Every structure is written in C-alpha cells, then in structure tokens.
Design a protein around this ligand. Structure first.
Ligand SMILES: *[C@@H]1O[C@H](CO)[C@@H](O[C@H]2O[C@H](CO)[C@@H](O[C@@H]3O[C@H](CO[C@H]4O[C@H](CO)[C@@H](O)[C@H](O)[C@@H]4O)[C@@H](O)[C@H](O[C@H]4O[C@H](CO)[C@@H](O)[C@H](O)[C@@H]4O)[C@@H]3O)[C@H](O)[C@H]2NC(C)=O)[C@H](O)[C@H]1NC(C)=O
Ligand SMILES: *[C@@H]1O[C@H](CO)[C@@H](O[C@H]2O[C@H](CO)[C@@H](O)[C@H](O)[C@H]2NC(C)=O)[C@H](O)[C@H]1NC(C)=O
Ligand SMILES: *[C@@H]1O[C@H](CO)[C@@H](O[C@H]2O[C@H](CO)[C@@H](O)[C@H](O)[C@H]2NC(C)=O)[C@H](O)[C@H]1NC(C)=O
Ligand SMILES: OC[C@H]1NC[C@@H](O)[C@@H](O)[C@@H]1O
Ligand SMILES: [Ca+2]
Length: 475
C-alpha cells in the first residue's frame, strides 16, 4: 500500500533526475519540453543542490554522491547574473546545510566520503561570505538584488517582507554550526525591525505587518497585510524559529501567535456561493481583497505546526479549514490540480465562469500550475498532526494528477491551464523545487516514520525551511 506508493514517488523522482542529468546537469535546470538547460539561479546547479535533501531521505546514494562531487567544484564567487539574496539563501544555503545535518545525523550510513560531507559546511560558509555585504546598509535590512562582483545593488529603497524575513533560519543555523556569530547577528538584526513594527499604522492588527521595509531606516513603507507571495514566508519562519530553539526565540512565537489570532479574526473569509469554504483575504486600509494564490496555501500547514507545538486546538481546527479550502481548488478543476490564483468576490465573477463559481466557490484568475508544492505541503502536515488517512489520500490524488498531466519524456513541466484537458499547453520549465519539495512531501506522506518527519507537540528534531530542506534544531 503506502510502501508501493512511496516507491512510486521515488520512481517519479528518479525519472526527473535521469532527464536532468541527461540533458542539463550541471546547469540550474532542465527545460522539460525541449530537453535542454537553463540557468535561472546563477548557474551553480540549483536542481542538483535542491535535490540533495530529498535524495538523502529517499536513500538514493548514487544521486547523493553525484551531487556532493558537484558541490565541491562550485565557485560561488562567480556568476554572470545578479543574485537574489532570498532565493540563494532558501535553495542553495539551506540545501547544503540540510544535506549536512542529514548526512551527519539520521543518514550517517549513506555516504562514505566524509570529506564531501564536510565540504557542505565549508561551501555554505563560502556562500554566506560572498553574500553578507548585502546586509551592510544603514539599518541592517539588506538589499535583495545584488552584484557579488562589484558589491553593487538594485538601487532599491525598500525590501520586501518575505525576502527580508525568510533568511534567519538558515543564517542562524550556519552560525550555530560554525561557531561564528556574525551570520546570526546580521540576519537577526534585519529581522528585529519586523518583530517591532514602526510606524504603528503599519501594523493594522496585532501581529499583521506591512509588505515592504525602508532600507535606510527599517520602518515599513506600507500597511498592506497579506499571506500571499511576497509576504507569506515571513509568518512561516516566526513559528519555525521557535521550533528551532524555543529558548532563544520565544519572542518569535509570541509574534506568530498574535499574527495567527488576528488572521483568524480578520482575514478569514468565506465565498458567497460556498459559505462552507474558507480562504484568507488581503487587507489594505479597511478594504478587503477577496483573492488568493497557490503560494498562500502554505498557511494551513503553518497553523497546524504552531497548533501542535503550542497545543492550541483552535489553530489546528483553523489550519484544517484552510487545508480543506485549498483541497477544494484542487478537486474542482478538470485535471484535479489547483490554479495559481483565484478569487471569490461576488462583484467580479467573470461571465464565462459564473456557473463554475456558483458550484465551486471561486473563479480562476490564473489557471497555470508551475509545479508548486504548497498544497501538498499542508496536506502533509495535516496528516502528520491528525493522523487521519484522508489527508494522505489527498496528497496521493494530487501526486497522480501531477504525474499524469505534467510528465514529459525527460521530467515534469509547468502547465498553462489546470481546467482544460491535459492542462492545456506545457511550459518549457521545471523549477528546482520540483526536486526539493513536490517529491519530498509526496514521499514523506507515504514513507516510514523517522526523525526528519514532522512530529506533534515538542518532539520535532528537524524543522523544514521554506524550500522543504530539513534543518536540525538547536542543541
Ligand atoms: C474535495 O474538496 C472538498 C473541500 O475540501 C472536500 O470536502 C470535505 O473535506 C473534508 C473531508 O474530511 C471535510 O472535513 C470534515 O468535515 C466534517 C463534517 O463537517 C460538517 O459538520 C461540522 C459539525 O461540527 C460543521 O462544523 C461543518 O461546517 C460541516 O457542516 C467534520 O466532522 C470533520 O471533522 C472531524 O475530523 C477532523 C479531522 O479530519 C477533526 O479535526 C475534527 O475534530 C473532527 O473529528 C472534518 O472537518 C469537509 O467538511 C468537506 N468540505 C466540504 C465543504 O464539503 C472533499 O472531500 C474533496 N473531495 C474529494 C473526492 O477529494
Ligand atoms: C556586476 O558588476 C560588474 C562590475 O565589476 C559588471 O562587470 C562588467 O561591467 C561592464 C558591463 O558591461 C563591462 O565592463 C564588463 O562587461 C564587465 N566588467 C567588469 C567590471 O568586470 C557586471 O556586468 C555586473 N553584473 C551584472 C550583469 O549586473
Ligand atoms: C506516472 O506516470 C508514469 C508514466 O506514464 C507511469 O509509469 C508507466 O511506465 C510505463 C510507461 O511509461 C508503463 O509501465 C505504464 O504505462 C506505467 N507503469 C505501470 C504502472 O505499468 C506511473 O505508473 C505513473 N505513476 C503513478 C503511480 O500513477
Ligand atoms: O512555489 C514555490 C517557490 N517559492 C516560494 C518559496 O518559499 C519556495 O517554496 C519555492 O522557491
Ligand atoms: Ca515555501
């Protein structure tokens, strides 16, 4: 049963790995339709590094060794493109750190070359050392888009909420492993401005903050509240940091609790046609935006994690409602995969979607699916927290739908319309998170228990970064 299903996910992973190795390694990614390669992540081999933690968990030694040997020859000081501090941190930094924590712990018997394992930490340090100048601003709030050769930047005056608040987990982990406090200080100083928002008008409700921060003084530049892309990850890390080290980050937890409670009281929203469904809205100056994204579906998982860790049944109950809503956007489409974005504002229901809206509870704004993992991620937490089989079935149903409509001879491709036969048209794109997230969560939902699995209460010995890379907790 679950064993066969687990093996099935490993086959899907192996399939994409073979195609990637065949036509793109060591480039950042495989182009699944033309069977070529692309480098949207500075050319250090994003798909190889992001695939590391998943391969280790699946016990694929051949894949692990190949990736380790490539990590050893990466020169993080050279790239012809500008670098995103956020993307580089959540994929590359966390990916190598994750492999290190994994291979040094629960998976110690998988690789022989201890030198390639230790090389993971050395390279993580070299990478942070090349990127740390980004934090050298008046406030400590970094520039996200930098030029690592000239030390130049975007010229930007503000930095996004998520891009600013989704660095602390991995930069602090690097400090705890190297003994060098510099990494934690930099990231935590940047985070400090988010934990004590100013002006007060930038925090409409307790815990809910604006979407952008001034680099010059660290104050918010707007009061737009949301859990959507651009904001999401900030709230996710608030509670995860607490799981990482409850002693050092009790303050993060308090801030998340406030955010969680204000979200339930003010962002909760039900479609007119389906009062039984719950989604989250965005808030800006007393006005509500009744639309959401696939990205936002990570929310149910955040509420479930904090719920079990804090033993708050109300957060758990709410998380399941968010999970149900996201599952609704998946099982209502033709392909059984959810849309990239949707709405439920009665006044804006498109004429050609009137009847879909009336029965499904929402209209599709963007029907594309770019191999995102947020819905399966929350399904995974729901299963681990409640232990109910239904949530595991939803992960499987989604995986089969993805395997059936996105699969190409070499890998998996993004799709243009989840509400049309075979997904409409395939995009010649396969993001690295296919390896890091979609395949990991799908596999974990059906694989045997282990330390790297999400646990209930205070039993977690690993915490997942935003790219699904398992990081060992402190101490
Ligand atoms: C396509 O997506 C659909 C939308 O997600 C999905 O629909 C269902 O999804 C859930 C399936 O399990 C279902 O959730 C359950 O609902 C149970 C009944 O709820 C009703 O009664 C309660 C009374 O307390 C009311 O409050 C509700 O408004 C509603 O009228 C509920 O009993 C159940 O809760 C138990 O189980 C959970 C853990 O699973 C515990 O935490 C809890 O304490 C209870 O023990 C749970 O909430 C959901 O209601 C339903 N959604 C809708 C709108 O129909 C479809 O299943 C899916 N289709 C396919 C084929 O995949
Ligand atoms: C990053 O900054 C470096 C500066 O060191 C840029 O290097 C180039 O600068 C000019 C761009 O037309 C030319 O002189 C060369 O192409 C090159 N010269 C140097 C200084 O190395 C580099 O283009 C910048 N990276 C990007 C693409 O933003
Ligand atoms: C995912 O899709 C693949 C490919 O369509 C399925 O594997 C197939 O492999 C061969 C053709 O590629 C044939 O053997 C079958 O068509 C099929 N494999 C089987 C079961 O015979 C794979 O099964 C799909 N995964 C799941 C679990 O649905
Ligand atoms: O949809 C996924 C993509 N963006 C959000 C990130 O947190 C990560 O999951 C991945 O980079
Ligand atoms: Ca994420």
């Amino acid at each position: 049963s679950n064993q066969a299903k687990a093996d099935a996910v490993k086959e899907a992973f192996q399939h994409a790995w073979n195609g990637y190795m065949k036509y793109a390694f060591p480039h950042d990614e495989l182009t699944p339709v033309s069977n070529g390669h692309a480098d949207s992540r500075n050319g250090w081999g994003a798909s190889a590094v992001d695939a590391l933690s998943t391969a280790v968990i699946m016990g694929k030694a051949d894949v692990v060794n190949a990736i380790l040997e490539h990590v050893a020859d990466i020169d993080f000081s050279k790239t012809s493109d500008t670098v995103s501090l956020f993307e580089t941190t959540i994929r590359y930094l966390a990916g190598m750190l994750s492999g290190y924590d994994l291979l040094q712990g629960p998976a110690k018997n998988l690789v022989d070359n201890q030198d390639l394992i230790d090389g993971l930490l050395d390279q993580s340090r070299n990478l942070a050392d090349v990127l740390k100048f980004a934090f050298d601003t008046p406030s400590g709030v970094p520039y996200n888009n930098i030029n690592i050769t000239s030390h130049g930047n975007d010229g930007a005056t503000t930095n996004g909420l998520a891009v600013t608040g989704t660095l602390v987990l991995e930069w602090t982990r690097l400090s705890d492993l190297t003994g060098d406090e510099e990494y934690a200080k930099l990231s935590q100083k940047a985070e400090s401005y988010l934990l004590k928002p100013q002006p007060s008008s930038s925090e409409p409700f307790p815990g809910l903050v604006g979407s952008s921060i001034n680099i010059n003084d660290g104050q918010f530049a707007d009061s737009r509240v949301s859990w959507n892309g651009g904001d999401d990850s900030f709230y996710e890390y608030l509670i995860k940091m607490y799981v990482y080290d409850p002693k050092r980050f009790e303050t993060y937890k308090d801030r998340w609790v406030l955010a969680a409670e204000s979200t339930i009281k003010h962002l909760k929203s039900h479609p007119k046609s389906r009062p039984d469904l719950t989604f989250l809205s965005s808030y800006s100056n007393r006005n509500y935006d009744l639309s959401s994204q696939h990205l936002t579906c990570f929310d149910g998982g955040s509420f479930l994690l904090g719920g079990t860790v804090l033993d708050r049944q109300d957060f758990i109950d709410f998380g399941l409602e968010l999970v149900d809503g996201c599952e609704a956007t998946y099982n209502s489409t033709l392909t059984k995969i959810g849309p990239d974005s949707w709405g439920w504002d009665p006044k804006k229901v498109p004429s050609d979607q009137k009847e879909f809206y009336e029965k499904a509870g929402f209209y599709i704004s963007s029907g594309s699916y770019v191999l995102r993992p947020e819905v399966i991620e929350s399904f995974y937490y729901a299963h681990r927290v409640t232990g109910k089989e239904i949530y595991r079935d939803w992960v499987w149903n989604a995986f089969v739908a993805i395997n059936s409509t996105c699969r190409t001879d070499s890998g998996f491709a993004a799709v243009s319309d989840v509400n049309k036969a075979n997904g409409g048209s395939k995009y010649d794109n396969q993001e690295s998170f296919l390896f890091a997230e979609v395949m990991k969560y799908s596999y974990l939902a059906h694989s045997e228990d282990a330390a790297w699995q999400v646990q209930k209460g205070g039993k977690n010995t690993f915490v997942y970064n935003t790219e699904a890379h398992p990081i060992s907790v402190a101490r």
